[PDB]
Write a protein that binds this ligand. Structure first.
Ligand code: HRR
Ligand code: MN
Length: 233
């Protein structure tokens, strides 16, 4: 079944029915009027950040992801517009600490204040990449508000209760990552994955997905996509 969509729910309503229990939800009417929703085009991102060095993750379309450095202009040029030869992702980067002028175009969701951490310790990451970027099925150690700004993203969510049916890697460095290709699972090797229930959604611009702490999430970009994630506790 699908992730429920709620429009500007109260802090208490979000705290009691989702944050505390750990239930995913899509929040509407919250970030749809953030400045990023009208300003951030490729033309705008180049003007404000084109000459800045950003980390980019590259990988083949069972291959393997390496990490390099290049200017935003370079990234867009040879991973977004010019019929890219490989997949490049400006992923998990604190672009807004590097570029404060872009931090004016977003805010911190008020729902974060319901956490036991400090606002200064919230990690804001930019996920800027082309159609086709795919995360592995994985779980993070903090709460997360995934704000979609450009394009859409298909996202699958498995509860932490389903960890057994997701076959996590046994190396400590990857114990938070699933061995299973979500959208083409090897059921002969990972049979328990087939009967694991899940939530799914297509996250579209203006929307915020609340990924509870340690909720397994799988993300695939359907179009040219720019997402901003808020990791908070
Ligand atoms: O908000 C979140 O928790 C979140 C969002 C995304 C996203 O792609 O939007 C995400 N993808 C990870 C991913 C994809 C493609 C190559 C590499 C990587 C890894 C970072 C090394 C993971 N986590
Ligand atoms: Mn994640």
């Amino acid at each position: 079944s699908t992730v429920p969509r709620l429009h500007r729910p109260s802090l208490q309503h979000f705290r009691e029915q989702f944050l505390v229990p750990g239930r995913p939800v899509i929040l509407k009417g919250v970030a749809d009027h953030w400045p990023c929703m009208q300003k951030w085009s490729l033309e705008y991102i180049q003007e404000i950040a084109g000459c800045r060095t950003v980390p980019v993750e590259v990988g083949s379309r069972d291959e393997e992801w390496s990490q390099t450095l290049m200017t935003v202009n370079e990234f867009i040029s040879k991973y977004i517009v010019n019929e890219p030869r490989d997949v490049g992702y400006l992923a998990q980067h604190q672009l807004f600490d590097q570029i404060p002028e872009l931090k004016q175009d977003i805010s911190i969701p008020d729902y974060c204040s319901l956490g036991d951490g400090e606002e200064e310790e919230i990690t804001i990451n930019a996920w800027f990449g082309p159609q086709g970027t795919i995360s592995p099925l994985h779980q993070d150690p903090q709460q997360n508000f995934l704000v979609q700004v450009m394009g859409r993203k298909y996202i699958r969510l498995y509860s932490p209760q389903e960890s057994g049916a997701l076959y996590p890697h046994d190396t400590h460095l990857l114990h938070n990552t699933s061995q299973v290709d979500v959208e083409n699972p090897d059921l002969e090797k990972f049979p328990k994955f087939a009967k694991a229930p899940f939530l799914s959604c297509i996250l579209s611009p203006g929307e915020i997905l609340f990924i509870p702490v340690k909720y397994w999430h799988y993300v695939r970009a359907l179009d040219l996509s720019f997402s901003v994630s808020f990791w908070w506790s």
